[PDB]
Design a protein around this ligand. Structure first.
Ligand SMILES: Cc1cc(Cn2nc(C)ccc2=O)on1
Ligand SMILES: Cc1cc(Cn2nc(C)ccc2=O)on1
Ligand SMILES: Cc1cc(Cn2nc(C)ccc2=O)on1
Lengths: 179, 245
């Protein structure tokens, strides 16, 4: 098993910590959802290849521009996250997160991930967003942003239901293995 | 870590650590506050264990088995003794607050009602100055430590054999040399997240809400000072590269 490194980036409200927690436990916690994620090394077999995939969160480093880049050395794949219940989190992708990752992780594949997909059709979310003249992110808006930023691909998931979570990390492993 | 503390923090939450008959005596808001305080202490125990792997297993093993050039082991593990002293003392205070709160006849049932004052003390005065000085030095030497490690692993046979030997056990799966360095750099930025969530469930006693608000401000002040005090050192750096952008 070859070792590869994954880092997840995105705004504080994108759900990156929850996504790493749910994948690493194969479960949405029933009693207590952790506030933080330390690290984890997942054993993943994708398309017949065995990989040890080290997982890292950047939560808590968003306001610290000299500490945050210390998370990037030797990254093999970036998950760049936004929440589907937050068009504001998608707007910060192209001119804040993307130029940073391209500078510190040149030529590393980026997968743009729309988190919290279960809220796209949630009535409470649609009501709260309508007060700011907004609506949940549409799948075409996510795909178009991924296309524009030069992402390897676009994927959606829900940490709450686990739908799409395994697929995201298996595809990140495939991207990390590409030359 | 020592077995007594590992067992006290083995459960996924405070609500699963205490006896169910004790849990049932508390209101939901108290349970939510205690579950976050328990996560702060449990992750501090694991952070001190990361520093002990760096000092006792890696640093000591290299000094005892390998013939490295002088200044190489300090280059791989900058500031580790100072970081160990800071966090072992902080962990000792957190564990003493828990132990004093135990009910007589129990080694697991407790409620911590007064964490804020301990956090203000940790993140103010001389201990905050030492944390700022040590993390500004450690984080500025982070890139150099990773590059020195990579160079030795690729060129020195005895070094590669040593690393593969000491990192083979399953309990070290998340704790290779580079992984320990990044776990330590990321520790300081987990504190605001944990303190803010404890504060969210600490409104019942106004003195406690005020103390945690003061502690959160002190932790953010320390992080801002460390972040402004970092510039990566590089082996063979020329003065012209330093004074130019
Ligand atoms: C060099 C470099 C570029 C960046 C990241 N960044 N760059 C720009 C121009 C705008 C936003 C942004 O986040 O960091 N270092
Ligand atoms: C906004 C929006 C998206 C759709 C249709 N739809 N598309 C996908 C890919 C997933 C869920 C899904 O509901 O309808 N409105
Ligand atoms: C050592 C060191 C260098 C710096 C950052 N720096 N500062 C100036 C004034 C000029 C170039 C430049 O890189 O911070 N610490």
């Amino acid at each position: 098993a070859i070792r590869k490194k994954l880092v997840i980036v995105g705004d504080g409200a994108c759900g990156k910590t929850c996504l790493l927690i749910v994948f690493s436990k194969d479960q949405f916690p029933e009693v207590y959802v952790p506030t933080v994620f330390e690290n984890y090394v997942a054993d993943i077999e994708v398309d017949g290849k065995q990989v040890e995939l080290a997982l890292w969160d950047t939560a808590g480093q968003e306001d610290y521009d000299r500490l945050r880049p210390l998370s990037y050395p030797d990254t093999d794949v970036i998950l760049m996250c936004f929440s589907i219940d937050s068009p504001d989190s998608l707007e910060n992708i192209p001119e804040k997160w993307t130029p940073e990752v391209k500078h510190f992780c040149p030529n590393v594949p980026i997968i743009l991930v729309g988190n919290k997909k279960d809220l796209r059709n949630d009535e409470h979310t649609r009501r709260e967003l309508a007060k700011m003249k907004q609506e949940p992110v549409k799948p075409e808006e996510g795909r178009d942003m991924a296309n524009r930023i030069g992402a390897f691909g676009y994927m959606e998931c829900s940490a709450k239901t686990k739908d799409g979570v395994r697929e995201v990390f298996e595809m990140a492993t495939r991207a990390a293995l590409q030359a | 870590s020592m077995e007594m503390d590992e067992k006290d923090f083995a459960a996924d939450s405070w609500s699963l650590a205490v006896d169910s008959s004790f849990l049932q005596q508390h209101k939901k808001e108290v349970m939510k506050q205690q579950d976050v305080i328990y996560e702060l202490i449990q992750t501090e125990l694991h952070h001190v264990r990361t520093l002990k792997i760096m000092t006792r297993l890696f640093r000591t093993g290299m000094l005892e088995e390998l013939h490295l050039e002088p200044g190489v082991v300090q280059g791989l593990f900058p500031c580790v003794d100072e970081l160990s002293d800071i966090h072992t003392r902080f962990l000792s205070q957190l564990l003493e607050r828990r132990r004093q709160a135990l009910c007589p006849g129990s080694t697991r049932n407790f409620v911590i009602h007064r964490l804020g004052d301990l956090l203000i003390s940790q993140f103010s005065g001389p201990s905050a100055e030492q944390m700022c000085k040590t993390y500004s030095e450690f984080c500025s030497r982070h890139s150099k430590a990773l590059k020195l490690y990579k160079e030795l692993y690729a060129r020195d046979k005895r070094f590669q054999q040593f690393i593969r030997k000491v990192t083979r056990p399953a309990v070290l799966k998340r704790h290779g040399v580079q992984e320990c360095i990044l776990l330590v750099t990321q520790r300081i930025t987990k504190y605001p997240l944990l303190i803010s969530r404890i504060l969210q469930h600490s409104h019942g006693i106004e003195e406690e809400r005020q103390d945690l608000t003061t502690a959160l401000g002190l932790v953010k002040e320390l992080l801002s000072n460390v972040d402004e005090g970092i510039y990566q050192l590089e082996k063979g750096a020329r003065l012209q590269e330093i004074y130019n952008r």
